[PDB]
RNA sequence: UUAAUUGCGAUAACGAACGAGACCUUAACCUACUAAAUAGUGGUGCUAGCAUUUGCUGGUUAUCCACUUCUUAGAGGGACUAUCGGUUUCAAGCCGAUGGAAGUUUGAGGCAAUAACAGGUCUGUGAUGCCCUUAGACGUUCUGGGCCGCACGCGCGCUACACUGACGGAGCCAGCGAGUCUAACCUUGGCCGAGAGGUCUUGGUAAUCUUGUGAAACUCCGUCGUGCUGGGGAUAGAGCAUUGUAAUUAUUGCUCUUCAACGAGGAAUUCCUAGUAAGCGCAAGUCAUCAGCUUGCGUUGAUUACGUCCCUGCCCUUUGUACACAC
């Protein structure tokens, strides 16, 4: 018994809160987005990741944990919410995943140029038409400066950016 | 399309409530010259006295002027509804008056005196000569006097 | 039997696909209907200063959400009713079925 | 200004280079065969290409 | 040929009908007349003051003859106007409600309008006849 | 049945629908004859097509106009546009085409916007100003 | 407080408010010879007020001395009838 | 009612009569720049005529009892005759004299 | 105690806060999303709000 | 030559990429498609009034019938400077006219390159390194004040200095939008109240109800009459209401009274080329209440260029430089 405007902005805020929760929790598992398909009899939540085995855990233990967390937080009834996991197609064609990989490499201690060029090589090997990586901040000094690593050609203007570019 | 010539008893500036009221202008906005009397009050009393409002104040009779003065001096006696009045539920007696030419200044002044001797905020403000209705003083009332 | 089906999506293509499959189902079952009535797509606007802080040229940004609403009226028995609510589901498309 | 870009001009040059015993001095049928014989994403660009092909065929009819 | 309120200018009809009502002298005037402004946004009361209730009533009668149903809210919206708020910018303020309410009550008692379903007031049969005849004479005054 | 057409005249945000059938020559506007459009001068602005083509061409037909949107001037322009377009539609469907040509020629020779709507539309409002093109005021010191 | 102005006063005419027989018969003998008559004329000529001018115009048009050609409010336009 | 001619003939006569034919303009090479006299186009003549007439009527009807309409009538009639009492003709002759002096 | 949180928070800038940043200034209260304008600019494409003009 | 390193082309360069453009959204056309009591129209039933001689104006939810011109959208079409004439090495293109809904890249926007500023922001962030502080804490919370405080100086604005007008009556026309759930939102209608507003109900989770948002400027009739005047309405006194726990340095609204400067604004300076400036109001944002502000919407709708590089700046080339935090 809610207007459709507020219904849809609530759907959007729900998707956003779920995305933020999952990109904070499953960062070590290649979380590359989520889909939310509501339906009669339930709402299903399709996570798209790489390490689906680690997302599932043993006996679906972690999936059960996440279903329970989602239900308790969003006031769903037990059984009205379901979580599925899927191996994402084209791992190289996913910016969030490569960014998380860069993050973990730089935290483990790898060097900036090595990491960024590994990323761009993997992407352009994965059937892309262009990739760009920008690392900004304090790099071997106090004064901050950016480093743009790139291969192939990219676009910056127009609706083709919303269509093709993944940022 | 009314043209009556006139008879020469018309009078220029007249006197009432200790105010040199102007003739040669209609009676409502003429009576507005009296401090304490505005457009609404004067229109209303000139309606209740049944004097024609198309008439100029200098073209009127002493009995009409006295009727109007009597009305404005005790208006509630003539079915004036007690919310046209500038001093209602006054501050001391609880009755409803309507101050006029010099009583307006005297009453304002004794109000300020009450607040000053009470040392109320508005009285201190009036004494200092500042704004009292809570306005901002940073950019206005610079050459206020 | 007086059913209204309202679809309240943001995705015009998915909405029109749903409408098309519904109407062709009702047409191959040969059910009298009032065709898909398309209400005005309502635009939800939010205007915001582009900047977090206050300095700079006062640049404003209007974000929009277009909500597309369709409704179809059907005369239908309970079996076709229950199966129609069984099916005609796609992501991002919200449906409401009401009788009378 | 109504200056055409090199996308339009190259496309028209190719269409003339390999479809001359064909499209004529008429924008309408040149358009209706451009959408038949080329893959163009937008009607606006299709019509620009058709117009430039018509202009070039007018040029070709005289020398 | 037949005539109606819609075949004559509104000013002419309203003047004629207000004169008819003032001459008939039976409708009403509440008693707070010759005191009031007709609007919280107006600055002075009406200037005629030998009437103007009949003008308001004629305007309301024409309005309800045209329309289907109205209320005191609609009439306040219609007869309101720009309140000069001194040094601040103007603003729409709606008219006084007691005035139009008592106008409609008097029009009911004299039988020109009635209460209607779907709320509000509606034009009655004898009131429609009255306005039509007044319009006919308002038009053929010009002979 | 009776010979009947229905047309529309337009302006900024006003539209005037006009039913035109066969009748005895009554020209109404929302409830009322054509002589009460109420600017008192755009009345002469709306008489124009009648006065141009001759009132004999309105004797056999009934026109009834319903106007909504805009303001008084735009409503008048919509009314005259709708009247002219409905007359032309009637003369095109029921009368022959030569009369339509003569009528259209007269209307366009007097004024182009009698049959064709003005394509001028409001420019939107942009920030930093009270209007489309205007900016607020620049302060340097 | 510098004003940056001139503030030149005026002569302050004293147009009449109510008439007598002299102004009345002056009106009655001088509203002819006027090819255009209106409030502005009856104030730049005879020094009556604008209200008196309105009333006198209605009066004279009642009798028939001045012919009307358009009586739009805020601008009354009369000529002389011969 | 006054000046029983066609009033359209009157206004076009006014426009023709109060149209400045010669006017000045800054011409120079930089620091050496003067107000040199030049001809005036007919469209600018018409526009300046209308502007002068309307401005004179406006600032005449301002702060006085006469109306904008009769002030404009005064202006148009005096301009069609040639008066030197009208704002328009006075400005016209001023500009023409200045341009003559600055030839 | 009973004075720890005594003051009412039924209205005003204290009764609301962003569901993300827990901030009282700059709330978008339209359509019942209750997000600061900055976090809204961050999460708009996720929520379904986009720029077209 | 172009708005455009946009193109013609020339050519120690060739072939490419980014940006521009193309693209997306929106506004304008479709009496051609799909349809639609959540938008309309016509007719037929019932019905009111005037005329009566057919007719004119209206109302009418379970009267139906028919349709989609207006309204809504979805898929599509349409303009591409089309045709013609001039002008140009006679190429890109430009100018004019005709047609057309539309011929300033159709109009307005969104997106928007490389390189940078030691621009702003740690007071948006459970974004953050370092430093400081960390229990009589700079955490958190309660009460009360302040952020409004005023001899003055600047910036954005609102009101106005009046008749192209103020006032009073009538007439009377929009569009963008918002709205209640575990709540109390937008509120019609009836009654009371001068007014603000109060009260009894009602509809709407919304193309259906508020809302034809019966807006205002505007028009028509009258009053006023060049008088710091019925222009203007700050500054003050008193009272009545509403929001809120609480209004006292007035939250705001209303009534009466008081009725200040201001007589078109000096040196200076801002915005603007068509449905644009300007005038006019309306919705939303903030919001318990508080618009003089902003974001958008529409209503009425001018003058004047259609040009130049004189001032202020921008771009490219050549040129000089004792400059490189770079006149
Ligand atoms: Mg009014
Ligand atoms: Mg104003
Ligand atoms: Mg504007
Ligand atoms: Mg004047
Ligand atoms: Mg019927
Ligand atoms: Mg040619
Ligand atoms: Mg563009
Ligand atoms: Mg920050
Ligand atoms: Mg502050
Ligand atoms: Mg500013
Ligand atoms: Mg005033
Ligand atoms: Mg008025
Ligand atoms: Mg509307
Ligand atoms: Mg400047
Ligand atoms: Mg508000
Ligand atoms: Mg406050
Ligand atoms: Mg603000
Ligand atoms: Mg230019
Ligand atoms: Mg040298
Ligand atoms: Mg050096
Ligand atoms: Mg130096
Ligand atoms: Zn936030």
Give the position of tokens 């629908």: F17
What is the F76 CA–ligand 3 centroid distance (Å)? 23
Tokens matching residue C83: 């199966």
**Distance, CA of I10 to CA of I43 (rounded, Å):** 28
**Distance, CA of I21 to CA of B2 (rounded, Å):** 79
> What DSSP designation does H5 have?
S
Does H67 reach chain G within 8 Å, measured CB to CB? yes
Main-chain dihedrals φ then ψ at residue B66, nearest 5 degrees:
-70, -35
Tokens matching residue C81: 């009713």
Contact call for B40 and E49, based on CB within 8 A: no
Element (DSSP H or E) covering residue B117: helix B103-118
Tokens matching residue E43: 């600055």
Burial grade of I29 (CB within 10 A; 0-12, 13-18, 19 or more): exposed
- Max CA distance (Å), chain A: 58
**Distance, CA of B17 to CA of D22 (rounded, Å):** 106
**Distance, CA of H26 to CA of H32 (rounded, Å):** 10
| Cβ(F21)–Cβ(F62) below 8 Å | yes
**Distance, CA of B51 to CA of B40 (rounded, Å):** 15
Tell me the DSSP string of A65-133. Answer: HHHHHHHHHHTPPTTSEEEEEEEPS-TTS-HHHHHHHHHHHHHHT--HHHHHHHHHHHHHHTT-SEEEE
Q: List chain C residues with CB under 8 Å of A5.
A: 42, 44, 67
Q: How many CB atoms lie within 10 A of CB E27?
A: 16
Give the position of tokens 């255009």: G36
Q: How many CB atoms lie within 10 A of CB F59?
A: 10
Helices of type H across chain C: 12-28, 78-86
What count of residues does chain H have?
103
> What DSSP designation does H31 have?
S
- Strands C3-9 and C95-99 turn out to be antiparallel
Main-chain dihedrals φ then ψ at residue A134, nearest 5 degrees:
-125, 120
CA atoms within 13 A on the CB side of F47: 12
- Max CA distance (Å), chain B: 63
**Distance, CA of A55 to CA of A17 (rounded, Å):** 19
Give the position of tokens 């209205």: I11
Burial grade of F107 (CB within 10 A; 0-12, 13-18, 19 or more): buried
Closest CA relative to residue B28, chosen from B39, B17, B20 = B39
Q: How many CB atoms lie within 10 A of CB F125?
A: 11
CA A98 → CA A103, B84, C75, distances in Å?
9, 79, 53
Does C42 reach chain I within 8 Å, measured CB to CB? no
Contact call for G36 and H2, based on CB within 8 A: yes
Give the position of tokens 């582009």: C50
Kindly list the domain boundaries of chain F, sorted by start residue.
Answer: 1-141
Closest CA relative to residue C95, chosen from C2, C38, C19 = C19
**Distance, CA of C9 to CA of A38 (rounded, Å):** 12
Q: Which of A6, A15, A19 sits opposite I31 (nearest CB)?
A: A6
**Distance, CA of F107 to CA of F48 (rounded, Å):** 9
**Distance, CA of I53 to CA of I38 (rounded, Å):** 20
Q: How many CB atoms lie within 10 A of CB G24?
A: 16
Tokens matching residue A56: 């599932």
Q: How many CB atoms lie within 10 A of CB I15?
A: 10
| Cβ(A30)–Cβ(A100) below 8 Å | yes
Helices of type H across H18-103: 42-61, 68-81, 87-101
**Distance, CA of B41 to CA of B31 (rounded, Å):** 9
What dihedral angle (degrees, nearest 10) is formed by the CA atoms of F103, F106, F109, F112? -40
| Cβ(B17)–Cβ(B61) below 8 Å | no
- Strands F27-29 and F61-68 turn out to be parallel
Contact call for C46 and I30, based on CB within 8 A: yes
**Distance, CA of H75 to CA of F45 (rounded, Å):** 28
Q: Is residue I39 part of an annotated ligand binding site?
A: yes
Q: Mapping DSSP to helix (H, G, I), strand (E, B) and coil, where does residue A45 land?
A: strand
* Phi-psi category of residue B89: left, alpha or beta, with phi > 0 → left and psi -120 to 50 → alpha: left
CA B41 to chain CA centroid, nearest Å = 8
**Distance, CA of F141 to CA of B37 (rounded, Å):** 49
* Phi-psi category of residue H101: left, alpha or beta, with phi > 0 → left and psi -120 to 50 → alpha: alpha
Kindly give, in sequence order, each residue whose CB lies less than 8 Å from that of residue H72, ignoring residues fewer than 6 positions away.
H53, H54, H57, H61
Protein residue with the closest CA to the C1' atom of nucleotide J206: A3
**Distance, CA of D28 to CA of D11 (rounded, Å):** 17
CATH number at residue D33: 1.10.60.20
- Strands G66-70 and G77-80 turn out to be antiparallel
CA angle, A108 then A111 then A115, to 5°: 85
Kindly give, in sequence order, each residue whose CB lies less than 8 Å from that of residue F108, ignoring residues fewer than 6 positions away.
F114, F115
Kindly give, in sequence order, each residue whose CB lies less than 8 Å from that of residue F50, ignoring residues fewer than 6 positions away.
F27, F58, F83
Element (DSSP H or E) covering residue D43: helix D43-61
Q: List chain G residues with CB under 8 Å of H67.
A: 40, 74-75
Give the position of tokens 């009036």: B126
| Cβ(B55)–Cβ(B30) below 8 Å | no
Q: Mapping DSSP to helix (H, G, I), strand (E, B) and coil, where does residue A7 land?
A: helix
Going A75 to A78 to A79 to A82, the CA torsion angle's sign is positive
R_g of chain G, CA atoms, integer Å: 16
CA A90 to chain CA centroid, nearest Å = 13
- What letters, b where the CB count within 10 A reaches 16 and e where it falls short, cover E60-89? bbbbbbeeeebebebbbeebbbebeeeeee
Interface of F with C in 55-74 (CB under 8 A): none
**Distance, CA of C42 to CA of C70 (rounded, Å):** 12
Q: List chain B residues with CB under 8 Å of E45.
A: 40, 43
**Distance, CA of A118 to CA of F128 (rounded, Å):** 46
Does E6 reach chain F within 8 Å, measured CB to CB? yes
CA F58 to chain CA centroid, nearest Å = 16
* Total domains in the fold of chain D: 1
Examine residue D1 and state whether it is found in any structural domain, yes or no: no
Does H39 reach chain G within 8 Å, measured CB to CB? no
Kindly list the domain boundaries of chain I, sorted by start residue.
Answer: 1-53
| Beta bridge partners of residue E97, listed in sequence order | none
Which top CATH class is A4-84? Answer: alpha beta
Contact call for B43 and E45, based on CB within 8 A: yes
CA B46 to chain CA centroid, nearest Å = 14
Element (DSSP H or E) covering residue B91: none
CA F58 → CA C6, F20, F25, F51, F107, distances in Å?
48, 10, 5, 11, 15
**Distance, CA of D14 to CA of D37 (rounded, Å):** 12
CA-based end-to-end distance of chain I: 54
| Cβ(F58)–Cβ(F9) below 8 Å | no
Element (DSSP H or E) covering residue F128: none
**Distance, CA of E142 to CA of F4 (rounded, Å):** 36
Kindly give, in sequence order, each residue whose CB lies less than 8 Å from that of residue D27, ignoring residues fewer than 6 positions away.
D47, D50, D51, D54
* Phi-psi category of residue C32: left, alpha or beta, with phi > 0 → left and psi -120 to 50 → alpha: beta
Element (DSSP H or E) covering residue B107: helix B103-118
CA angle, G26 then G29 then G35, to 5°: 115
Closest CA relative to residue G68, chosen from G52, G59, G55, G79 = G79
Q: How many CB atoms lie within 10 A of CB F110?
A: 14
- What letters, b where the CB count within 10 A reaches 16 and e where it falls short, cover F80-106? bbbbbbbbbbbbbeebeeeebeebbee
**Distance, CA of B11 to CA of B33 (rounded, Å):** 17
- What letters, b where the CB count within 10 A reaches 16 and e where it falls short, cover H35-44? eebeebeeee
**Distance, CA of A68 to CA of A90 (rounded, Å):** 30
**Distance, CA of B117 to CA of A17 (rounded, Å):** 64
CA B10 → CA A151, B23, B59, distances in Å?
103, 9, 5
Contact call for B40 and E45, based on CB within 8 A: yes
Q: How many CB atoms lie within 10 A of CB F26?
A: 12
Does G56 reach chain H within 8 Å, measured CB to CB? no
Q: List chain I residues with CB under 8 Å of C64.
A: 49-53
The three-state (H, E, C) secondary structure of chain E, written as one string: CCCCHHHCCHHHHHHHHHHHHHHHCCCCCCCCCCCCCCECCCCCCCCCCCCCHHHHHHHHHHHHHHCCCECHHHHHHHHCEEECCCCCCCEEECECHHHHHHHHHHHHHHCCEEECCCCCEEECHHHHHHHHHHHHHHHHCCC
Going H69 to H72 to H73 to H74, the CA torsion angle's sign is positive
Tokens matching residue H54: 């309307």
Determine the distance in angstroms separating the CA of I12 from the nearest CA of chain A, rounded to an integer: 22
**Distance, CA of G69 to CA of G81 (rounded, Å):** 11
Going A98 to A102 to A103 to A105, the CA torsion angle's sign is positive
Q: How many CB atoms lie within 10 A of CB C6?
A: 16
Element (DSSP H or E) covering residue H14: helix H7-17
CA-based end-to-end distance of chain A: 37
CA angle, I10 then I12 then I13, to 5°: 120
Resolution (A): 2.6
Tokens matching residue B41: 């009050």
| Beta bridge partners of residue C73, listed in sequence order | C4, C34
> What DSSP designation does D2 have?
-
Task: Find the helix packing angle between A95-108 and A112-125, rounded to 10°.
Answer: 150
Tokens matching residue B110: 């004794």
Closest CA relative to residue G39, chosen from G81, G71, G77, G79 = G77
- Strands B14-16 and B19-21 turn out to be antiparallel
């Amino acid at each position: 018994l809610i207007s459709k405007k507020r219904k849809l902005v609530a759907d959007g805020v729900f998707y956003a809160e779920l995305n933020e929760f999952f990109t904070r929790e499953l960062a070590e598992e290649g979380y590359s987005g989520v889909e939310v398909r509501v339906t009669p009899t339930k709402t299903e939540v399709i996570i798209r990741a790489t390490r689906t085995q680690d997302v599932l855990g043993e006996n679906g233990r972690r999936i059960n944990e996440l279903t329970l967390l989602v239900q308790k937080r969003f006031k769903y009834a037990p059984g009205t919410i379901v979580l599925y996991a899927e191996r994402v197609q084209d791992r190289g064609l996913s910016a969030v995943a490569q960014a998380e990989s860069m993050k973990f490499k730089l935290l483990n201690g790898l060097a900036i140029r090595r990491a960024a060029y590994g990323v761009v090589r993997y992407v352009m090997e994965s059937g892309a038409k262009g990739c760009e990586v920008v690392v900004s901040g304090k790099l071997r000094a106090a004064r901050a400066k950016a480093m743009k690593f790139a291969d192939g050609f990219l676009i910056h203007s127009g609706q083709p950016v919303n269509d093709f570019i993944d940022t | 399309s009314l043209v009556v010539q006139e008879q020469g008893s018309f009078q220029h500036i007249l006197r009432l409530l200790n105010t040199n009221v102007d003739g040669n202008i209609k009676i409502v906005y003429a009576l507005t010259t009296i401090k304490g009397v505005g457009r609404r009050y004067s229109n209303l009393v000139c309606k209740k006295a049944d004097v024609d409002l198309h008439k100029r104040a200098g073209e009127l009779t002493q009995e009409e002027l006295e009727r109007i003065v009597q009305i404005m001096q005790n208006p509630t006696h003539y079915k004036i509804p007690a919310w046209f009045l500038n001093r209602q539920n006054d501050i001391t007696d609880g009755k409803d008056y309507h101050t006029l030419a010099n009583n307006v200044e005297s009453k304002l002044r004794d109000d300020l005196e009450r607040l000053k001797k009470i040392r109320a905020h508005r009285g201190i403000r009036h004494f200092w000569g500042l704004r009292v209705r809570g306005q901002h003083t940073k950019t206005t009332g610079r050459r206020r006097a | 039997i007086k059913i209204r089906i309202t679809l309240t999506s943001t995705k015009v293509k998915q909405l029109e696909n749903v409408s098309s499959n519904i109407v062709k189902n009702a047409e191959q079952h040969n059910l009298v209907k009032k065709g898909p009535v398309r209400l005005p797509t309502k635009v939800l606007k939010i205007s915001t200063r582009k900047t977090p802080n206050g300095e700079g040229s006062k640049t404003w940004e209007t974000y929009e959400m277009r909500i597309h609403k369709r409704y179809i009226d059907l005369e239908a028995p309970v079996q076709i009713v229950k199966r129609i609510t069984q099916i005609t589901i796609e992501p991002g498309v919200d449906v409401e079925v009401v009788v009378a | 200004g109504r200056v055409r870009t090199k996308t339009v001009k190259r496309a028209s040059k190719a269409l003339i280079e390999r479809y001359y015993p064909k499209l004529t001095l008429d924008f309408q049928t040149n358009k209706r065969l451009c959408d038949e014989i080329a893959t163009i994403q937008s009607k606006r660009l299709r019509n620009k290409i058709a117009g430039y092909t018509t202009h070039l065929m007018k040029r070709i009819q005289k020398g | 040929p037949g005539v109606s309120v819609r075949d004559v200018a509104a000013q002419d009809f309203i003047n004629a009908y207000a004169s008819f009502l003032q001459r008939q002298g039976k409708l009403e005037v509440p008693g707070y007349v010759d005191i009031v402004k007709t609007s919280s946004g107006n600055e002075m009361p009406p200037q005629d003051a030998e009437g103007w209730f009949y003008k308001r009533a004629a305007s309301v009668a024409r309005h309800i003859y045209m329309r289907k149903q109205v209320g005191v809210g609609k009439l306040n919206k219609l007869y309101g106007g720009a309140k000069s708020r001194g040094v601040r910018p103007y603003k729409h303020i709606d008219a006084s409600g007691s005035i139009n309410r008592k106008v409609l009550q008097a029009l009911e008692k004299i039988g020109i309008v009635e209460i209607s379903p779907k709320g509000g007031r509606r034009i009655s049969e004898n009131g429609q006849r009255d306005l039509d005849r007044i319009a006919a004479q308002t038009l053929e005054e010009d002979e | 049945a009776v010979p009947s057409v229905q047309t529309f005249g337009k302006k900024k945000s006003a539209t005037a629908v006009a039913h035109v059938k066969a009748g005895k020559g009554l020209i109404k506007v929302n409830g009322s004859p054509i002589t009460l459009v109420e600017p008192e001068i755009l009345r002469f602005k709306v008489y124009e097509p009648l006065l141009l083509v001759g009132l004999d061409k309105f004797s056999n037909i009934d026109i009834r106009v319903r106007v909504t949107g805009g303001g008084h001037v735009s409503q008048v322009y919509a009314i005259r546009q709708a009247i002219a377009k409905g007359l032309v539609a009637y003369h095109q469907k029921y009368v022959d085409e030569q009369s339509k040509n003569e009528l259209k020629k007269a209307f366009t020779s007097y004024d182009r916007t009698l049959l064709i709507a003005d394509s001028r539309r409001p420019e939107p409002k942009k920030f930093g100003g009270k209007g489309a093109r205007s900016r607020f005021q620049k302060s340097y010191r | 407080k510098k004003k940056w102005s001139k503030k030149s006063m005026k002569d302050r005419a004293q147009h009449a408010v109510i008439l007598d027989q002299e102004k009345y018969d002056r009106i009655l003998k001088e509203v002819p010879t006027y090819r255009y008559v209106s409030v502005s004329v009856l104030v730049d000529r005879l020094k009556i007020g604008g209200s008196l001018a309105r009333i006198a115009l209605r009066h004279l048009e009642k009798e028939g001395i001045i012919k009307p050609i358009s009586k739009h409010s805020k601008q009354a336009i009369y000529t002389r009838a011969t | 009612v006054l000046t029983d001619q066609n009033p359209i003939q009157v206004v076009v006569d006014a426009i023709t009569n109060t149209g400045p034919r010669e006017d000045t303009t800054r011409v120079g090479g930089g620091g050496a720049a003067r107000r040199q006299a030049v001809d005036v186009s007919p469209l600018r003549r018409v526009n300046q005529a209308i502007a002068l007439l309307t401005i004179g009527a406006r600032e005449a009807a301002f702060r006085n009892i006469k109306t904008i309409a009769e002030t404009l009538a005064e202006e148009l009639i005096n301009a069609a005759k040639g008066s030197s009492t009208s704002y328009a003709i006075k400005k016209k002759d001023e500009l023409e004299r200045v341009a003559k002096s600055n030839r | 105690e009973n004075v720890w949180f005594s003051h009412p928070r039924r209205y005003g800038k204290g009764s609301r806060q962003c569901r993300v940043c827990s901030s009282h200034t700059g709330l978008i209260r339209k359509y019942g999303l209750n997000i600061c304008r900055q976090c809204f600019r961050e999460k708009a494409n996720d929520i379904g709000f986009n720029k077209f003009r």
